Amino acid sequence: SELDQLRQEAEQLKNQIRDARKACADATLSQITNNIDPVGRIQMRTRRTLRGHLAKIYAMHWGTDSRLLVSASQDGKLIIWDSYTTNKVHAIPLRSSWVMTCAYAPSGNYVACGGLDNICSIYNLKTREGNVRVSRELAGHTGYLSCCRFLDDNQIVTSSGDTTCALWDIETGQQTTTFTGHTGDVMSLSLAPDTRLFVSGACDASAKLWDVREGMCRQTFTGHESDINAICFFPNGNAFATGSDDATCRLFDLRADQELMTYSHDNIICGITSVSFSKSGRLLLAGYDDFNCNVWDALKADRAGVLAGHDNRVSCLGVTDDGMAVATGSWDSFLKIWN
Amino acid sequence: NNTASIAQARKLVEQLKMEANIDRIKVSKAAADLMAYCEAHAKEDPLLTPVPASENPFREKKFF
Amino acid sequence: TCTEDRIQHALERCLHCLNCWSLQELVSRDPGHFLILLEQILQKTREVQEKGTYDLLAPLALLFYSTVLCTPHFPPDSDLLLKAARTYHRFLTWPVPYCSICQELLTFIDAELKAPGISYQRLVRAEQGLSTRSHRSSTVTVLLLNPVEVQAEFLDVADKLSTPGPSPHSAYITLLLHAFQATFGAHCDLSGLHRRLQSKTLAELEAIFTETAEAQELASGIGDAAEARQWLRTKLQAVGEKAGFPGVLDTAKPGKLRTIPIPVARCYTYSWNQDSFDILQEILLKDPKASTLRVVVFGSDRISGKVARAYSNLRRLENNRPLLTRFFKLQFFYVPVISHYLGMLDPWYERNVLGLLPILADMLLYYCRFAARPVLLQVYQTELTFITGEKTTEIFIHSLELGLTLQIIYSKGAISGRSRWSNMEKLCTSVNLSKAALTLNLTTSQIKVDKVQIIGSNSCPFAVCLDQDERKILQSVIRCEVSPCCLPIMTF
Amino acid sequence: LIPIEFVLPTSTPETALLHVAGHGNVEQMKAQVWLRALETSVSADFYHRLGPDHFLLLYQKKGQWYEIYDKYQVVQTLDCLRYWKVLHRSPGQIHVVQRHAPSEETLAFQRQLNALIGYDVTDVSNVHDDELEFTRRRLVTPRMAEVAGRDPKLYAMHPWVTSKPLPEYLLKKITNNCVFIVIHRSTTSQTIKVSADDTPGTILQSFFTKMAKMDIPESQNERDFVLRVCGRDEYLVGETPIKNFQWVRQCLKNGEEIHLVLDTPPDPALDEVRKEEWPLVDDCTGVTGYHEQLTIHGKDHESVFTVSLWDCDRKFRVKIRGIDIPVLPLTVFVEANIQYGQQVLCQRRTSPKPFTEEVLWNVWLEFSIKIKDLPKGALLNLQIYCGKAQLLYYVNLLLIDHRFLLRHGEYVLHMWQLFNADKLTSATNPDKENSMSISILLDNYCHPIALPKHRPTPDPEGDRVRAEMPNQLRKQLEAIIATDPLNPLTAEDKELLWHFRYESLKDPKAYPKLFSSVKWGQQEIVAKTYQLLAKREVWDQSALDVGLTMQLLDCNFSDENVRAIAVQKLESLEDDDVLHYLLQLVQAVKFEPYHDSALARFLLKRGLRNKRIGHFLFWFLRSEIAQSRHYQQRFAVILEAYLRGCGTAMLHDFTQQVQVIDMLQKVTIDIKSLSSQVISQLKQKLENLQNLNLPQSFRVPYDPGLKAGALVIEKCKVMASKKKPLWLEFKCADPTALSNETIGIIFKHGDDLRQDMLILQILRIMESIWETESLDLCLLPYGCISTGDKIGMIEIVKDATTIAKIQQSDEVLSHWLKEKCPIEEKFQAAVERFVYSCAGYCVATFVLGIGDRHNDNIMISETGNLFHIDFGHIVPFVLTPDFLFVMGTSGKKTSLHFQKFQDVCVKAYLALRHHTNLLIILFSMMLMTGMPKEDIEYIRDALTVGKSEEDAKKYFLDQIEVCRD
Ligand SMILES: Nc1ncnc2c1ncn2[C@@H]1O[C@H](COP(=O)(O)OP(=O)(O)O)[C@@H](O)[C@H]1O
Numbered sequence A: 001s002e003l004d005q006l007r008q009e010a011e012q013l014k015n016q017i018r019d020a021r022k023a024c025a026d027a028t029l030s031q032i033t034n035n036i037d038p039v040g041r042i043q044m045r046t047r048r049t050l051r052g053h054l055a056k057i058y059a060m061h062w063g064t065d066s067r068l069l070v071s072a073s074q075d076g077k078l079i080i081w082d083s084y085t086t087n088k089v090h091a092i093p094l095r096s097s098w099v100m101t102c103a104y105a106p107s108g109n110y111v112a113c114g115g116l117d118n119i120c121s122i123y124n125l126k127t128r129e130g131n132v133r134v135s136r137e138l139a140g141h142t143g144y145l146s147c148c149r150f151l152d153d154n155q156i157v158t159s160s161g162d163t164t165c166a167l168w169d170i171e172t173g174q175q176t177t178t179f180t181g182h183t184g185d186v187m188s189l190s191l192a193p194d195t196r197l198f199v200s201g202a203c204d205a206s207a208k209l210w211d212v213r214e215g216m217c218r219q220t221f222t223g224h225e226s227d228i229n230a231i232c233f234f235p236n237g238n239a240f241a242t243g244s245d246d247a248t249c250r251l252f253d254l255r256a257d258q259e260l261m262t263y264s265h266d267n268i269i270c271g272i273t274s275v276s277f278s279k280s281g282r283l284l285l286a287g288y289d290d291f292n293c294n295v296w297d298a299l300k301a302d303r304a305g306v307l308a309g310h311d312n313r314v315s316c317l318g319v320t321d322d323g324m325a326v327a328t329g330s331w332d333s334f335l336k337i338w339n
Numbered sequence B: 001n002n003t004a005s006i007a008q009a010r011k012l013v014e015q016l017k018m019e020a021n022i023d024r025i026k027v028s029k030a031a032a033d034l035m036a037y038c039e040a041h042a043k044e045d046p047l048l049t050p051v052p053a054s055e056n057p058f059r060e061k062k063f064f
Numbered sequence C: 001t002c003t004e005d006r007i008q009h010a011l012e013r014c015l016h017c018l019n020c021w022s023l024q025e026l027v028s029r030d031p032g033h034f035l036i037l038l039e040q041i042l043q044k045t046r047e048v049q050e051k052g053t054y055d056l057l058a059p060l061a062l063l064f065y066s067t068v069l070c071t072p073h074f075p076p077d078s079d080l081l082l083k084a085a086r087t088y089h090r091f092l093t094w095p096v097p098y099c100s101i102c103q104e105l106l107t108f109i110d111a112e113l114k115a116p117g118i119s120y121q122r123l124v125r126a127e128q129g130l131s132t133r134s135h136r137s138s139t140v141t142v143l144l145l146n147p148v149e150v151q152a153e154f155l156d157v158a159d160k161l162s163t164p165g166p167s168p169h170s171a172y173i174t175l176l177l178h179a180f181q182a183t184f185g186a187h188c189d190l191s192g193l194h195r196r197l198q199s200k201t202l203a204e205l206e207a208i209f210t211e212t213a214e215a216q217e218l219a220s221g222i223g224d225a226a227e228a229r230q231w232l233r234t235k236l237q238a239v240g241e242k243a244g245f246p247g248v249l250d251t252a253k254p255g256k257l258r259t260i261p262i263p264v265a266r267c268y269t270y271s272w273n274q275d276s277f278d279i280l281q282e283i284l285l286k287d288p289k290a291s292t293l294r295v296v297v298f299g300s301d302r303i304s305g306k307v308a309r310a311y312s313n314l315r316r317l318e319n320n321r322p323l324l325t326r327f328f329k330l331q332f333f334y335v336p337v338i339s340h341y342l343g344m345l346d347p348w349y350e351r352n353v354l355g356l357l358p359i360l361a362d363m364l365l366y367y368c369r370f371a372a373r374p375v376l377l378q379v380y381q382t383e384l385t386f387i388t389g390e391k392t393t394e395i396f397i398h399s400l401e402l403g404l405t406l407q408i409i410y411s412k413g414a415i416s417g418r419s420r421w422s423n424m425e426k427l428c429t430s431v432n433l434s435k436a437a438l439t440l441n442l443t444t445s446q447i448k449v450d451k452v453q454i455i456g457s458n459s460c461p462f463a464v465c466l467d468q469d470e471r472k473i474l475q476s477v478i479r480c481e482v483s484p485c486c487l488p489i490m491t492f
Numbered sequence D: 001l002i003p004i005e006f007v008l009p010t011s012t013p014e015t016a017l018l019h020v021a022g023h024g025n026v027e028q029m030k031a032q033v034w035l036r037a038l039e040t041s042v043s044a045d046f047y048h049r050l051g052p053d054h055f056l057l058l059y060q061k062k063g064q065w066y067e068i069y070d071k072y073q074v075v076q077t078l079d080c081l082r083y084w085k086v087l088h089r090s091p092g093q094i095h096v097v098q099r100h101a102p103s104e105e106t107l108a109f110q111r112q113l114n115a116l117i118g119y120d121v122t123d124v125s126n127v128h129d130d131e132l133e134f135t136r137r138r139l140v141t142p143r144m145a146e147v148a149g150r151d152p153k154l155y156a157m158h159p160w161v162t163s164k165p166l167p168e169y170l171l172k173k174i175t176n177n178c179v180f181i182v183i184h185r186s187t188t189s190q191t192i193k194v195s196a197d198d199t200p201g202t203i204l205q206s207f208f209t210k211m212a213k214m215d216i217p218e219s220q221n222e223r224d225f226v227l228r229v230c231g232r233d234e235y236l237v238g239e240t241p242i243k244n245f246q247w248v249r250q251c252l253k254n255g256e257e258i259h260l261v262l263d264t265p266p267d268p269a270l271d272e273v274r275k276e277e278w279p280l281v282d283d284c285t286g287v288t289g290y291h292e293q294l295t296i297h298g299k300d301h302e303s304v305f306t307v308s309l310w311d312c313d314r315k316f317r318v319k320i321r322g323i324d325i326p327v328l329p330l331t332v333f334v335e336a337n338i339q340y341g342q343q344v345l346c347q348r349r350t351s352p353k354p355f356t357e358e359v360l361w362n363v364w365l366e367f368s369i370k371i372k373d374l375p376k377g378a379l380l381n382l383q384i385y386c387g388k389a390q391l392l393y394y395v396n397l398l399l400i401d402h403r404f405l406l407r408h409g410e411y412v413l414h415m416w417q418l419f420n421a422d423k424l425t426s427a428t429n430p431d432k433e434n435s436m437s438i439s440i441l442l443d444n445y446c447h448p449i450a451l452p453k454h455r456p457t458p459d460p461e462g463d464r465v466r467a468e469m470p471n472q473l474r475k476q477l478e479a480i481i482a483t484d485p486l487n488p489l490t491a492e493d494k495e496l497l498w499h500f501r502y503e504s505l506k507d508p509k510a511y512p513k514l515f516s517s518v519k520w521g522q523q524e525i526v527a528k529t530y531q532l533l534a535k536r537e538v539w540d541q542s543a544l545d546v547g548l549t550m551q552l553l554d555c556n557f558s559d560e561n562v563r564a565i566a567v568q569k570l571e572s573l574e575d576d577d578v579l580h581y582l583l584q585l586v587q588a589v590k591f592e593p594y595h596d597s598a599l600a601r602f603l604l605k606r607g608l609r610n611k612r613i614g615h616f617l618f619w620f621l622r623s624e625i626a627q628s629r630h631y632q633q634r635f636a637v638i639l640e641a642y643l644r645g646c647g648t649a650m651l652h653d654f655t656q657q658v659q660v661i662d663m664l665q666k667v668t669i670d671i672k673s674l675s676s677q678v679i680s681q682l683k684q685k686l687e688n689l690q691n692l693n694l695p696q697s698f699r700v701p702y703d704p705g706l707k708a709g710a711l712v713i714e715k716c717k718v719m720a721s722k723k724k725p726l727w728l729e730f731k732c733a734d735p736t737a738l739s740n741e742t743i744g745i746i747f748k749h750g751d752d753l754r755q756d757m758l759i760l761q762i763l764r765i766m767e768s769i770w771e772t773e774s775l776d777l778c779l780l781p782y783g784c785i786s787t788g789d790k791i792g793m794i795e796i797v798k799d800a801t802t803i804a805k806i807q808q809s810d811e812v813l814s815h816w817l818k819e820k821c822p823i824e825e826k827f828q829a830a831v832e833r834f835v836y837s838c839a840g841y842c843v844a845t846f847v848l849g850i851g852d853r854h855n856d857n858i859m860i861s862e863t864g865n866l867f868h869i870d871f872g873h874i875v876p877f878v879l880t881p882d883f884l885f886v887m888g889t890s891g892k893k894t895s896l897h898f899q900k901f902q903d904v905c906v907k908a909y910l911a912l913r914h915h916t917n918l919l920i921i922l923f924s925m926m927l928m929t930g931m932p933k934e935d936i937e938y939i940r941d942a943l944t945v946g947k948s949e950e951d952a953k954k955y956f957l958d959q960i961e962v963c964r965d
Helices: A002-024 B002-020 B027-041 C002-015 C019-028 C031-051 C058-069 C080-089 C098-114 C118-127 C152-162 C168-187 C190-199 C202-220 C227-243 C278-283 C301-320 C339-345 C347-354 C359-370 D026-040 D045-049 D079-087 D104-117 D131-138 D140-148 D152-157 D168-172 D200-210 D248-254 D471-482 D491-499 D508-514 D523-532 D537-541 D546-553 D562-570 D575-590 D598-609 D611-625 D632-643 D648-672 D676-691 D754-772 D803-808 D811-820 D824-848 D881-886 D896-929 D949-964
Strands: A046-050 A057-062 A068-073 A077-082 A088-093 A099-104 A110-115 A119-124 A133-139 A145-150 A155-160 A165-169 A174-179 A186-191 A197-202 A207-211 A217-221 A228-233 A239-244 A249-253 A258-263 A272-277 A283-288 A293-297 A303-307 A316-319 A326-329 A335-338 C138-145 C267-271 C291-299 C329-336 C380-386 C392-396 C399-402 C407-412 C420-423 C431-435 C438-442 C445-449 C451-455 C477-484 D002-007 D015-020 D055-061 D064-067 D092-098 D178-184 D190-195 D259-261 D315-324 D331-340 D358-370 D379-386 D390-398 D409-414 D437-442 D726-731 D742-749 D791-795 D800-802 D858-861 D866-868
Touching: A002 B002, A057 A316, A057 A326, A068 A099, A068 A110, A077 A110, A110 A133, A110 A145, A110 A155, A119 A145, A119 A155, A155 A186, A197 A228, A197 A239, A217 B002, A239 A272, A239 A283, A249 A283, A249 B027, A258 B027, A272 A316, A283 A316, C002 C019, C002 C031, C002 C058, C019 C031, C019 C058, C019 C359, C031 C058, C031 C080, C058 C098, C058 C118, C058 C359, C080 C098, C098 C118, C098 C202, C098 C227, C118 C138, C118 C168, C118 C202, C138 C152, C138 C278, C152 C267, C152 C359, C168 C190, C168 C202, C168 C227, C202 C227, C291 C301, C301 C329, C301 C392, C329 C339, C329 C347, C329 C359, C339 C347, C347 C359, C407 C438, C407 C445, D015 D026, D026 D045, D055 D079, D079 D092, D104 D611, D104 D632, D104 D648, D131 D140, D131 D632, D140 D598, D140 D632, D168 D248, D190 D200, D315 D331, D331 D358, D390 D409, D471 D491, D471 D508, D491 D508, D508 D537, D508 D546, D546 D562, D546 D575, D546 D896, D562 D598, D575 D598, D575 D611, D575 D632, D575 D754, D575 D896, D598 D611, D598 D632, D611 D632, D611 D648, D648 D676, D648 D726, D648 D742, D648 D791, D754 D824, D754 D896, D800 D803, D803 D811, D803 D858, D811 D824, D811 D858, D811 D881, D824 D866, D824 D881, D824 D896, D824 D949, D896 D949
Parallel strands: A057 A099, A099 A145, A145 A186, A186 A228, A228 A272, C138 C267, C138 C291, C291 C329, D002 D092, D178 D259
Antiparallel strands: A046 A335, A057 A068, A068 A077, A077 A088, A099 A110, A110 A119, A119 A133, A145 A155, A155 A165, A165 A174, A186 A197, A197 A207, A207 A217, A228 A239, A239 A249, A249 A258, A272 A283, A283 A293, A293 A303, A316 A326, A326 A335, C380 C392, C380 C477, C399 C431, C407 C420, C407 C451, C431 C438, C438 C445, C451 C477, D002 D015, D055 D064, D055 D092, D178 D190, D315 D358, D315 D437, D331 D379, D379 D390, D409 D437, D726 D742, D742 D791, D800 D858, D858 D866
C-alpha cells in the first residue's frame, strides 16, 4: 500500500521524464553534423616517452601550467614529471602501494592521491624545507578512493567505492558535502568549468549531475550497458562524455537531458578506460583496453585516427589545458606525450 | 523491514521529482549550441588545427 | 622563565658528586619551585612510560618521592598528584623490579591525597624519637670511624652531626608549624601562629602533635582521600579552637608559604680503630621494627674484607644468637674514603658516593635518608679440619692462600647446571685462590674452580690464610672443603 | 565473596560454611579451609598430620564427580559457582577427601600399555611444563561420551559398508540386478540368487522360509544367525544394499565368487571397557576472559590480579646467558628469530665469539615486535651458526603456554643438532648428557600476563557494502584465485584480497589465499579476522572438498580458528574416506604447535567409533613414536588416551601382534649379524620360536581379518638380496578357509619404509579418482607397513617373479608369459591385463617423478599383471622394448592393443589433471614430513598445470614417444 503507491507513483514520474525528454528529441546530432566538413585523419606522432615507473600506472593528471604532470603507479611511487624536459621534478614514495588516482591541484602547490587504503593523502610540493611532506590524510570513506580532483589549495572532491562522493575542506579534513544517490562504485569524475557542478561515473551504468554548491543529484543519465569507467565535460560545460565497459562511448548534453551521440564501432569490443576532449572539444580521445586509443570526431562520430603507442592496456590519458599535448599512461609503466 | 524500503523509496521519488522538474532544451538547439562552440574555438585547438612546429614546445626546441 | 630553565637545566645535569645537592637547594628557596619541578618530572616520567627506556626510572622515582615529601602545600584546586597517579599507574606492565619501585610509590601518593604532608610527619617523628603512646617509633644514627686513616674533614662533619642542637620543644614547633602549613597552605599566617606556639608549653605541644599525628594518620585511615582532606581540615579546626588559636586560620587574606627544611635526626659519633663491632654491643646496655638503627661505616680497601667478616659475624652472632638485632633493625652504609663493585651495578651510587652544615655533609644526609635498596656481594663459606679432625667454619671473600705432596679434588661448573668433576691429586708447593668463582693457583697453574676439597696426609698440620688476612689465622689443619654460600648493606 | 559449605571427613563427615574471595586463585582457597578446620575440628590431630595437598576438592555436577585440577584458575570462572547460580544452590557444597595410592592392577595395566606404545606416558623427565599431563586428564570427557556413543552390536561386527556409486565396468558385471550367494554351512553348500540391492536382514529372513522344511537348531530362530565371509572375519550386516560392501564390490572386479557362511553374533561383552576413576576435569578449563576483565586500565591497583597481554607496548626482550657443550666437536654466534608458521617475523643476532666448550654472553636482545602484538602461535627459534656460515644446532620455545600465560623466568633448553618438518619442534632433547645447552631469561612480572579471548561482534562492514566491484578489479581478483596453491602472493595481491575480504569469502576455493595474506604480526588486523570468520554460511554449505581442506591443515596456517573450520568440514566424511587419507592426516599433526587440538580429538572420536580405523590408527602412531623422537611425546599421549577406550579384545589382539614382531626382529637382526648353516640356524631359530610364546592366532597388521598361524618352516627361507630379507609363509588359522594358501610375508632390514608407505597410500588415492570416472588400470597395492627403524613387514604377491630373473633366464619376455599362459584365450586375456597395468604404472609414477628406475625394481606377475617394488631408495618412465613386443607391435607399427595403450593413457592422464589441487598438496606435504621446494616443482612442471587439455595430450604423448625413442 504505502510502499506500492510510492512505487507506482515512482514508475509514472519516470515515463514523464522519458516523455519530457523524448519531446526534445527532435533531431539527432548525426543528422545536423552530416553537413559540417568531416574532421579528417588526425595522424599523431609520439613526441615524448616518460620512462621510470616500475609497474602499472594507475593515474595521471596535467597541471594547470600545461607542463607538469603527476603520475601514480602500482609500484607505490608518485612521480612529478617535467613534460617539456622529461625530468622528474619529484619522486615521492607512497605509504600505500595501491594508489588508484591522482590530481594536480590547479594552483600547482598541492598534489593528492589515494586508493584502496581508504584515504586521500594530500602532499605538498612547495614544503617549508623543500621536502615532500604530507599535508593531510582525508580519511573517513568506507571504500577505496577511486578518484579525486582539487577545487583549490584548500578544497578537494574525492570519489570512492562507498557508492557516494564527498566534498572536503583540506584544512579541517572534514566532508563538507556528501553526494549520495549512486548505486555503485564511482570509477571517475569530472568537475564542470564552474566549480558549482561536477559529473560522476559509476558501475550502475548511469551518470549523475551534482551541484557542488548544494550536494543534490540534479539529473540522471543512462544508456550504457555496462559500468561507466570514465567521464568528462564538454569544453563549454553543457555536455559530457562517458566511457564504459560496453565498448561504447556516449555524449550527453546537460540542457537536452539525453544522449546526443554514440561513438562505437563493430570492431571495438573491449571496455573504455579513460576519455578526454581536445581544448576545443571537436576531438574526443578515448582510451581502450587493447593498447590502443582511438580518435573520434565528436560531431561526426567518425574515428578520425588511432593512437597505438602502448604495449599494455591504455589505463589513463589526459589533455593539457591549452590542448597543446596529450599524455597517455598505461599498464606498461610508460606515459606518452603526443602532438 | 518497511521503514528502510519506505525511507529509500521516498528518497527515490523525491529525487526523481528533482530531476523531472527541469526545463530541457530541444536537441536541435542543444546540438547547434555545441557545434557552434567548436566552430568558434577550432583555431584555438592545436589538436584540431596542426600548428607550426616552431610554436610546438615538444618538437622544435629542447631548451625551455 | 630563567627559574624554570635553571630548575629544568639543573635536573638534566644531574641525570646525565654534589649535583643532587644543588637541585634540592635551588628548589627550597621558593615554595613555588616545588610545584614547578614536579611538573617537569611527570613530563619526563610519562615520556619513559612511552619510550619505555629502562636506565632512567629509578633516579626519577626517588626525585619525585623526595620533592613530594618537601612540598609545603598543594593548592586545593591544583591536582598534580592525580596526574602523577596516571603516569605511574601504567607501569604495572613492566618487568620486576621496575614494577617493584612503582607499586610502593603509588601507595605513597594515595596517602598524600588523604592527609597531605603525612609523609613528612612520619619521618621526623622517628628521626628524633618524638614518639608517643599511639605512635611509637625511634631511629638512631651512629658513625663508626677509623681516625688513623680517615680524612680530617669527615671528623668535623661527624662532630657537627653528633651535636644535639635541636631541642624537643623546638622540634614540636617545626613539626606543628609544618603540619598546619601543609594542610592550609598560604592561607594561614605562619608568623601569627608561630608566635602563639612559642608561648605554649612542651606538654601541650606533645598533646597537640600526638592528636594531630593521630589525626594525620587517621585521615590516611579514612576510605576516601578527597573529602578526607576536608575531614582532616575539620579536625584541625577543633584542635586550634580547643587549644585556642583559630584566628590564624580562616584568613581570607592568605599568609605566606615558608620552605621548612628537613630537620637533622639524632646522631652519635664513635671511633672504630677496632675492626670488630663489639662497640655496638657495649652501647646496647644503655618494638623490634618500630625502631631502626642506621650505622654508617667509612670506606677503605684494607678495611673492607675485615668488615665483611666482621659484618658476617654480626650476621652470624646475631642471626644465630640475636641480641642487638632483636631490639631494632640494622642498616649499614659503606662510604669510600667494595665500593668498586657497588658502583658497577648502580651508577647512581658510583657518581653520588664513589665519586668522592657543609655541602659535603649536606649531600650525605640525602644519601642516607633515601637509599633503600641493598646490594649483597657473594661470599665463600669454608670449613677447616684441624689435626684433631674437628670442623671449624670460616668465611672468606677476596682470596685464600694455603701452603710438596697434597690431595686436591676440584670440579668445574657450567651455566647449564651440569657439573663435571676433576680429581687429579698432585704434589705442589703452595695453593692460592683469588676471587676473579675462585681460581686455583697451583705452584704455576690457574683455573677458575667452583668446588674444591683439599685433604692433607697423616693428619699433617699446616697453616692456612683467609683473604690475605694476618689476624684471624688457623693452623694445624689437615683438610678443608670450599663451596660458595636484618643488617643489609644499603645502596641506591 | 560467596558462601560455600565444605564437607570435611571428620565424623558423619563434618562440614562448615565458609567464604572465598570472588577474584582469588584456586590454590589460595585451599588454605582458607585448612585453618578453619584446624580450629573447628573435633580432632584436629588428623588434619595436623597432613596438609592441603593430601586432599582433593570434588563437586558433583548433576551426579558427575568433577576435580578442580588447575590451581591457577580464576575462582569466579568455576562452573560449580556458575552451575550453582543456575541451580540456585546456596551455600554451594564441595567435599574434601584424601588421595590414595595406585593399586597393583592399575600399575599392571599401565605397565601393560607402556609396552604396547614403545614408550612411557607417565614419564616426566624431559619436560618443562605440565602440558603433556594436562591433556591426559583432559581427553577423558570426549572418550566417555564417544564410548557412550557406540552401540554394542554394530561396533563388534564392524561392517565395511560404502556409499560411492558403482563404476561403469562393474555395472556390466551385474546382470538383471542380481548376484549369487554361495551359502556354505557345515557341509551343505546351498547356492541362491538375490538382487544386488537387498539387505542381509531380508536374505536371512527369506532363507529360513525357503529351507523352512543344514545343521540349524530347531529351538533357535533366524534372530540367532548372521552372515560371515569365508576364509576371513568380515561380517555382512547393517541396513545397506548388498552392492554396498567393499567386499562384494571386490569380487565382481576379480571375476570370482562370493562364499558366505552362517555364524553367531560375536559377543558384545567381549569389548567391555574398564571403569573410570579419574574425576572429570573442569569444564571451564581453558577460559581466560575478555580484554575488559584482564586490563589494568580502568581499575584500582588494589584489586589488580592480571594484566592483559594487549596493554603492554614494551618491545619484546630476551636475555641469553651462554652456551655449554661438554664435548669438543672457529667462530660462533647465536641468532634468535621470532617465527610464525615459516615466517621470520623479526630477528636479532649476537656478536661473533670464540668457540670454547662454554661461551658466555650475558646480553639482552630486543625485538621490534610488541608484547601486545604476540600471535598465539609464536616460536622463538634459536640457532648456533659456525664460522662461511654453517648451521649447527637449533631449539624452539612457545612464547605463550597452553593456558594463556606468557613465558617468564630462566629456561635451560637442550638443543637438537643438524626447510624440514622436524625443524618446527617444540620439545627438548632427551639426551641430557652430551647435548648443546642454552640458558635464557624471560623477565618476571608481579602479575600473570594473560591473553583474553577475542569477542566477535556484528560487523556492519559486511552488512552494507555489497562489494559489487568494478569488472576490472573483479577480473584481477579472480585472476590470482585461479592460480594453484603453490603460487606465491605478492603484497599487492595481499592488499587486494585483504580489502575485498567480505566478497572473496563467497568463494570456498579462495580460502587458502585469503588467509595467506592476513597480517598476523598486528593485533588489530587479527581482531578483524575473528569477525571475518564469524560469518561462515558460504563455507558451511559448500561442497566437501578434501584436496582443499588439507590446505588449511598444512603448516602455514597455524592459527586456532583457521584449523578449526577445516576439521568441521572433515567431520562430514565417512569411514571409507577417512581410511584413504588417515595416513595423510596423522603425519599432519606434526605441524600443530600445541598438543591438544580439534585434529587430535577428531582422530580419537573416529577410532573409538570404528574398529578397522582403530586397527590402522594404532599401527601408524606406533610407527612414529619409535621412529621420530621429535614428536614421540605428542603421539604417545593420544595413543594411550585411545587404548583405554577400545574394548579388551582389541587390547589382547594388539598384544599378540606385537609379540610376534618382537621375536622376528631379534631373529632378523641376529641373522644379519653375519651357507646352509644360516637356513639351519634360521630354522633352528624358527623352531625355537614355536618353543617360545609365538602366538598361534594374530591378525596380520595390514588386514584386520586375514589371520595367520604356525610357519611352514620348509618354506621359510632367506633370499640372496644384499639386505637379506626373511621370507615367511604362515598358514591360515581360519577353520573354514575354502582354499588353503600361504600368507606370505617379507622382512627387509636396511630400508626405511615411511617413504614407501606414503607412496602406496598415494597410489590408493589415485584409484578412487579413476573409480568415479569409471575406468581402471589394474594397479596392485600390496599391504606394506613399518614397525620400527628400517624394519617392516610386507605382503607377498603370489605367482610373481622379478623381470630381471626372466631377463637373466627382448623376445625372452614373450616366451615366459606364454609358458605361464599356454592357453591363447588366457594368453590374450593376460595381454589385456598387461596393457592396463603397464600403462597405469607408467602414468602414475610419472606424476610422482620416480618412474626412472631399473628393471630390477619392476616385477611381473604370472597372471599378466605388472607392478613395482622397492621405491624407497629414490627418462619419464620405463617402457623398455620388451613391452613393445608384448604389445603386439614392434618398432612403431600399431595394433588394437597398442591403440588401447595410447588411448587408455590419454584417458587417464587427463583424468588426473581435474584434481591437480589434490595432488599438489599430498605430494609435497609428504616430501616435507617424509625424507629428512625446487624438488617439488616436478609436481607442477610436467603435470601441465593450467593448459589446454589437447596440448596435454600432445605434451603427454611427447613423453611416451620419447620413452619409446
Ligand atoms: N611382495 C613381494 N613378493 C615377492 N617378492 C618380493 C616382494 N617384495 C620384494 N620381493 C623380492 O625382493 C627383491 C627386491 O629387493 P628388496 O629386498 O625389496 O630390496 P633390497 O634388494 O635392497 O633388499 C626381489 O628379488 C623380489 O623378488
